[PDB]
């Protein structure tokens, strides 16, 4: 059977997009903390999202807005990139549209300790229309909170990866997020007193239930 062993093998693969997202956020916060000007940062972020792979589909930097600015075009200054060929989108920066500093993935990281990461709920990005989960983290400059960095995980890509990996290991799996939402369910069911192997990535992190596939 080796159910526990195969469930660990699967968990290790499910961890790869997690570690991937953290690593890309570390690069983003390096760019945000740096002295590079806006144009240099745009170039480095375009390059970064060009080289990242896996389930990562979009993300960028969200500087603390200057909402007091008289000129509406100066208040928001996000640097957001979408892997369609990488496109920069400016859509979050028109003040008429509300800005970005009240989004849940921004507020979760706002003024939190550097080095902490935060999960968004599943959502469809209003401008790219990609269904996704976002990991965010704050970055600081001169000891003062400066902005939020984000990486977006494509839900479609994550599902494909988890399900394909589970199938290869002859497993069924349910993966739930920190909000109780079923991110992936592949060939998972219980009957005839089948054992379920449970693995938690953390108290408010992903949870998996694993069964043997027949």
User: Which residues are near Cl ion by CB under 5 A?
Assistant: 184-185
Kindly state the smallest distance separating residue 214's Cβ from Cl ion, in Å.
19
Q: Are 172 and 213 in contact (CB under 8 A)?
A: yes
- Based on CB atoms, which residue is closest to Cl ion, 16 or 156? 156
- Based on CB atoms, which residue is closest to Cl ion, 24 or 184? 184
Kindly state the smallest distance separating residue 94's Cβ from Cl ion, in Å.
35
Burial 36-53, CB ≥16 within 10 A → b, else e: eeeeebbebbeebbeebe
| Other CB atoms within 10 A of residue 124 CB | 11
- Based on CB atoms, which residue is closest to Cl ion, 157 or 185? 185
| 12's tokens | 């290790």
Kindly state the smallest distance separating residue 13's Cβ from Cl ion, in Å.
16
| 200's tokens | 């938690």
Kindly state the smallest distance separating residue 146's Cβ from Cl ion, in Å.
37
| SS3 state of residue 24 | helix
Alpha-carbon span 193 to 200, nearest angstrom: 22
Question: What residue number has its CB nearest to Cl ion?
Answer: 184
- Based on CB atoms, which residue is closest to Cl ion, 109 or 155? 155
Alpha-carbon span 58 to 157, nearest angstrom: 13
Phi–psi pair at 185, nearest 5 degrees: -135, 115
- Based on CB atoms, which residue is closest to Cl ion, 97 or 164? 164
Kindly state the smallest distance separating residue 173's Cβ from Cl ion, in Å.
10
């Amino acid at each position: 059977n080796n159910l526990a062993l195969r469930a660990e093998l699967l968990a290790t693969q499910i961890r790869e997009p997690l570690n991937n997202s953290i690593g890309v956020l570390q690069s983003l916060t390096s760019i945000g903390k740096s002295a590079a000007d806006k144009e240099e940062q745009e170039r480095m972020l375009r390059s970064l999202f060009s080289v990242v792979g896996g389930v990562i589909i979009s993300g960028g930097l969200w500087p603390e807005p200057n909402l007091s600015a008289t000129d509406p075009s100066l208040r928001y200054d996000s640097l957001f990139f979408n892997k369609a060929q990488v496109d920069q989108l400016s859509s979050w920066n028109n003040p008429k549209a509300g800005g970005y500093d009240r989004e849940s993935w921004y507020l979760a990281a706002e003024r939190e300790a550097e080095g902490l990461y935060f999960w968004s709920p599943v959502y469809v990005d209003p401008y790219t229309r990609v269904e996704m989960i976002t990991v965010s983290t704050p970055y600081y400059r001169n000891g003062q909170f400066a902005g939020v960095a984000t990486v977006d995980l494509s839900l479609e890509s994550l599902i494909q990866f988890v399900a394909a990996t589970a199938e290869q290991y002859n497993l069924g799996v349910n993966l739930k997020d920190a909000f109780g939402v079923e991110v992936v369910s592949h060939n998972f069911r219980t009957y005839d007193n089948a054992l379920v192997s449970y693995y938690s990535f953390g108290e408010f992190n992903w949870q998996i239930e694993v069964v043997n596939a027949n």
